[PDB]
């Protein structure tokens, strides 16, 4: 397994938005996994806040699966 | 190898900013790889625009290594 420990403000922002949206979606963890196209243990880890297990692309994948838009701004 | 074909506006934005910044950095591909902590073949692929080989986290890793800030906005 890869564990992630960088970009934590961004990673936590994406995770909290994904958790909150899933929490009042009316979906069970099973139906949530079906919608996101991931396994139930993956949903469990997300809802338990195991943030280290989630790459930025996986979080962005799931945010988009639930119908949200992610926009980036790059600052120099 | 993983190949990526989703989130293409975001992926291309990050790649173009990374290429442009490296292109007038005064660095050779070797010195660029040293700064980013990746291999020279990885730099080559980036500069050749092999966008499919680069996950969003790897692009964000490298953008931050060169001293840029990435901010996300999530829209519903």
């Amino acid at each position: 397994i890869h564990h992630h420990h960088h970009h934590m403000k961004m990673r936590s922002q994406l995770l909290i938005v994904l958790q909150e949206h899933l929490r009042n979606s009316g979906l069970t963890q099973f139906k949530a996994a079906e919608l996101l196209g991931v396994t139930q243990p993956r949903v469990s880890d997300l809802m338990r806040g195991k943030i280290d297990l989630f790459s930025l692309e996986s979080l962005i994948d799931m945010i988009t699966s639930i119908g949200l838009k992610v926009e980036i701004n790059i600052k120099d």
Side-chain angles (χ1 to χ4, degrees), chain A residues 3-8 10-68 70 72-74:
Chain A
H3 296 276
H4 298 271
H5 303 295
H6 299 89
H7 311 120
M8 294 306 95
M10 201 181 320
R11 195 179 318 272
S12 55
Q13 284 174 49
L14 294 165
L15 168 85
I16 291 286
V17 174
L18 192 55
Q19 289 176 320
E20 288 167 347
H21 279 72
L22 293 170
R23 202 167 282 281
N24 75 349
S25 66
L27 298 175
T28 57
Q29 285 196 2
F30 169 76
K31 297 292 281 180
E34 281 204 324
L35 162 63
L36 301 174
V38 306
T39 64
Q40 298 183 61
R42 188 70 162 160
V43 179
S44 174
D45 289 344
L46 178 71
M47 295 315 293
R48 291 174 75 203
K50 296 192 172 188
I51 191 166
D52 61 296
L53 300 173
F54 291 93
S55 73
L56 296 170
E57 187 151 343
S58 69
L59 291 172
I60 292 160
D61 276 349
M62 290 186 287
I63 285 281
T64 71
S65 287
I66 64 160
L68 301 174
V70 174
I72 312 291
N73 179 48
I74 298 164

